[PDB]
Structure 1
Amino acid sequence: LPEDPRWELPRDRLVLGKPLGEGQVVLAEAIGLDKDKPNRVTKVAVKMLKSDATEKDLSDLISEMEMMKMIGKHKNIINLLGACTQDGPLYVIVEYASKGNLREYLQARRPPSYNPSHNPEEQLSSKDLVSCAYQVARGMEYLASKKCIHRDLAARNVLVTEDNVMKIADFGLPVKWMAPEALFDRIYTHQSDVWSFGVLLWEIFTLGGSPYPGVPVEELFKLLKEGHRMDKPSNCTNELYMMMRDCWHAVPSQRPTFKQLVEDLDRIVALTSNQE
């Protein structure tokens, strides 16, 4: 594989740590990732091919990496940090998110709807929830501006850092998150991503609720054509419900853009107190 000096990090500068999940992702420590601070260690996530991996697996991993190079940096996406491509197997180094995906993060913060965790965490304010939504919309607005269409936007594909920064995941590569047009015609656009975001908003305000609970997949597209839409979560403002519903406009052209959603969420965040 051709070397790329803009991203290469010597292999011995990376201390492989524990599994993070399934190629596969391990936690690691990078020594001197910032060339200005060569004695600093930074926790990172690393992706590499699985044990019984194919040629297709390899070139997808490369495509993902090359795509990540082009998209550029934004604080609300999982950014590329480097790669080990030479002295052995391919490693792709990206930012680490210690607090899990948003779906788990939220569930684990439910009041003791059911809390599956034996290790529960502290309650989130109303302002925190809106601000989570705002950050995710910022992520997507940036991705949309670089002409990237996600296709599987959902709370499970948002990750949360140690500092509670929301970061879009796997943006360079389930039916209950798809716009109808994607579901039927396999037509994915920025507008279908906006649909997916509405579902993601509903997850936020159900603290990780499963969408369309009890509805079988088979039925769902029909129900959707007939104008079926999820009910408002028990604890969600009418305003934020309207945003969900706008995201779920049957006509893709009539949905708001991520640009507009960011603006709207910015206003709502500033209008929601830390105490309400």
Structure 2
Amino acid sequence: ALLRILKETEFKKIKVLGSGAFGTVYKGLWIPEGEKVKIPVAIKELREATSPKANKEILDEAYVMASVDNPHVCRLLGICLTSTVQLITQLMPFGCLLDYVREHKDNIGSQYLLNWCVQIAKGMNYLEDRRLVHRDLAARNVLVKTPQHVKITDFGRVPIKWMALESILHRIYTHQSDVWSYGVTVWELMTFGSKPYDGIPASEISSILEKGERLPQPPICTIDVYMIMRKCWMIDADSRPKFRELIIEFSKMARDPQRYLVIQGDERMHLP
């Protein structure tokens, strides 16, 4: 739809959820003016976003973030402009998928893991169709609406260990560098939220990658799943899968989960 211009009296902050590079995120409640319905919302308030030039840049960008319309992409619902900038979306009450997998890894099954892979590829496919490059896809930027329903967020306008080699060496970002980060995102899921390249400093990653090293095979992953991941991390960006292809391939596996991921016995052995 469109970006609603919200009045500060329309919504209240309830709790601080976090704070990042951009600002502070709060849980809140939004009662649309006129309406009787009360919508739980997440509200991000930017730090020092007060310059005229950035104010216009932010508004222009916000219009585009409010224009996405897909079940697996978070949409910006509105903005509130006062002394500060506040960005409002619907609250995803289960929080981010990275945290969710770390919390629930003792009970997460193969059907859920592979469906999350499908859903993220579907929302990434939609952004590709909208000509929107993500630049920071990671399990921490996938939110959980319900255990069965995830949505991508914080896309649009340095996470070295998620970044395609070209992005690291040349600052090139395209849909194909998004495909690489997708591969790393999937690895995070299949490892139940392990940290990629753990203990290796960021400063070394381009070298390791140039030498041709890559994240290892997650123990529950069958070879065909690991192949998809390996394919996302080829040097030649045009050799990597396309999001449309990833939808098909993971959809096929989701039809037969137990064939493609094996989650059995000693879960201490499910870690890379």
- Which of 62, 66, 70 is the aligned partner of 1:65? 62
**How big is each residue's C-alpha offset from its partner over 1:11-53, in whole Å with a ceiling of 9 and x where there is no partner?**
32212221121122211112247x7xx2111101112233x55
SS at match of 1:80: coil
Quote the residue 2:161 is aligned against: 176
| Structure 1 stretches lacking a partner, 5+ long | 112-122
| Structure 2 stretches lacking a partner, 5+ long | 264-272
Quote the residue 1:251 is aligned against: 236
Quote the residue 1:31 is aligned against: 31
**Quick one: structure 1 residues 27 and 170, their matched pair in 2 at CA, closer, same or farther if it must change by over 3 Å?**
same
Quote the residue 1:80 is aligned against: 76
Quote the residue 1:116 is aligned against: none
**Quick one: structure 1 residues 162 and 17, their matched pair in 2 at CA, closer, same or farther if it must change by over 3 Å?**
farther
- Which of 203, 210, 227 is the aligned partner of 1:218? 203
- How many pairs were matched up? 255
Q: CA deviation at 1:57?
A: 6.3
SS at match of 1:8: strand
User: Distance between the aligned counterparts of 2:108 and 2:55, measured in 1?
Assistant: 40
Quote the residue 1:90 is aligned against: 85
**How big is each residue's C-alpha offset from its partner over 1:107-155, in whole Å with a ceiling of 9 and x where there is no partner?**
11133xxxxxxxxxxx111100001111111110101111111111111
**How big is each residue's C-alpha offset from its partner over 1:83-129, in whole Å with a ceiling of 9 and x where there is no partner?**
333x6643321121111211111111133xxxxxxxxxxx1111000
**How big is each residue's C-alpha offset from its partner over 1:209-246, in whole Å with a ceiling of 9 and x where there is no partner?**
11112222222211211211121011112111010011
Contact 1:134 1:262 (8 Å CA) reproduced: yes
- Which of 2, 5, 15 is the aligned partner of 1:8? 5
User: Distance between the aligned counterparts of 2:12 and 2:214, measured in 1?
Assistant: 48
SS at match of 2:204: helix
Quote the residue 1:117 is aligned against: none
**Quick one: structure 1 residues 217 and 49, their matched pair in 2 at CA, closer, same or farther if it must change by over 3 Å?**
closer
**Quick one: structure 1 residues 163 and 11, their matched pair in 2 at CA, closer, same or farther if it must change by over 3 Å?**
farther
2:39 corresponds to 1:42: yes
User: Distance between the aligned counterparts of 2:71 and 2:115, measured in 1?
Assistant: 14
2:95 corresponds to 1:110: no
**How big is each residue's C-alpha offset from its partner over 1:165-222, in whole Å with a ceiling of 9 and x where there is no partner?**
2111111221011111111011111111101111111101001011112222222211
User: Distance between the aligned counterparts of 2:224 and 2:113, measured in 1?
Assistant: 14
User: Distance between the aligned counterparts of 1:204 and 1:30, measured in 2?
Assistant: 32
**Quick one: structure 1 residues 267 and 97, their matched pair in 2 at CA, closer, same or farther if it must change by over 3 Å?**
same
**Quick one: structure 1 residues 127 and 162, their matched pair in 2 at CA, closer, same or farther if it must change by over 3 Å?**
closer
Q: CA deviation at 1:80?
A: 1.5
Segment drifting more, 128-137 vs 75-84: 75-84
Output the amino acid matched with 2:166: E
SS at match of 2:78: strand
SS at match of 2:27: strand
SS at match of 2:4: coil
SS at match of 2:79: strand
Quote the residue 2:119 is aligned against: 135
Output the amino acid matched with 1:11: E
TM-score, normalised with respect to structure 1: 0.84
2:172 corresponds to 1:187: yes
Contact 1:100 1:159 (8 Å CA) reproduced: yes
Q: CA deviation at 1:273?
A: 5.6
**Quick one: structure 1 residues 145 and 136, their matched pair in 2 at CA, closer, same or farther if it must change by over 3 Å?**
same
Output the amino acid matched with 1:28: G
Contact 1:109 1:124 (8 Å CA) reproduced: yes
Output the amino acid matched with 1:137: A
**Quick one: structure 1 residues 219 and 49, their matched pair in 2 at CA, closer, same or farther if it must change by over 3 Å?**
closer
Contact 1:177 1:195 (8 Å CA) reproduced: yes
- Which of 121, 132, 146 is the aligned partner of 1:148? 132
Output the amino acid matched with 1:153: L
TM-score, normalised with respect to structure 2: 0.85
SS at match of 1:171: coil
Quote the residue 1:233 is aligned against: 218
SS at match of 1:231: coil
Segment drifting more, 215-224 vs 197-206: 215-224
RMSD: 2.4
